[PDB]
Amino acid sequence: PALKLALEYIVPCMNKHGICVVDDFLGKETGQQIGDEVRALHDTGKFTDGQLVSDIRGDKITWIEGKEPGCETIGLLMSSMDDLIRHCNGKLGSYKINGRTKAMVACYPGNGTGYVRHVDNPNGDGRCVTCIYYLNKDWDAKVSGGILRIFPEGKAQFADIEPKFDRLLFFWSDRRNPHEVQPAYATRYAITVWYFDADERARA
Ligand SMILES: Cn1ccnc1CN1CCC2(CC1)CCN(c1ccc(-c3ccccc3)cc1)C2=O
Ligand code: NI
Numbered sequence: 438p439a440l441k442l443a444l445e446y447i448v449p450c451m452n453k454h455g456i457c458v459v460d461d462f463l464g465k466e467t468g469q470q471i472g473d474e475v476r477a478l479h480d481t482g483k484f485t486d487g488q489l490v491s492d493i494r495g496d497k498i499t500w501i502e503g504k505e506p507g508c509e510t511i512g513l514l515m516s517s518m519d520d521l522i523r524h525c526n527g528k529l530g531s532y533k534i535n536g537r538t539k540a541m542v543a544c545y546p547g548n549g550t551g552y553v554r555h556v557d558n559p560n561g562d563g564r565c566v567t568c569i570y571y572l573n574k575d576w577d578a579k580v581s582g583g584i585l586r587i588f589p590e591g592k593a594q595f596a597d598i599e600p601k602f603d604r605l606l607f608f609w610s611d612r613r614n615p616h617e618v619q620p621a622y623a624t625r626y627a628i629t630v631w632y633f634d635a636d637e638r639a640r641a
Pocket of ligand 2: 555556
């Protein structure tokens, strides 16, 4: 229920906390299909070899426009993220969201790598909202790790997000939300898109 989710949940939660989670976003049939497509990209070698950690390598990535052969349902996910944001009108902060990046599909290989603490957009590059879709069936963070931990600015607490199947996450891309991915001991997939604020971007 896009507009309803938008108006009753995503808008008030973002404006109050700046971090929001939607479980069971596309449902398990579409979700599995996205899973399958991401796995096919992995098995057919479309991912990079992974972030040079040490040689130990971490998260493998691939940029996905949405129209590529074999990425149709990823395309569908993207269109559906786009619908959510659009049905938010201009009510996320005072931002006017007019574009987004392609989809970054990330795959942690399960070798104990994660991702160091960072801010997605620390220097005003246009990106106002980070949108992440998780695809990991029966993820148990107690056993496989890979929690996304956010450190909201000015709070003395963590916000730990499990990379659960069919979960969608929004958070502010700027310094309000430093985050890290804790070590992952199982294959962990996520798809991220960033939304641009027209003014910040016209001006980057
Ligand atoms: C893996 N993961 C989990 C949680 N956090 C992360 C890492 N997080 C921060 C670093 C990345 C990925 C996300 C590396 C790519 N990237 C990125 C850079 C530049 C642009 C860009 C530049 C110009 C014009 C338009 C877009 C878009 C995206 C990031 O921000
Ligand atoms: Ni990040």
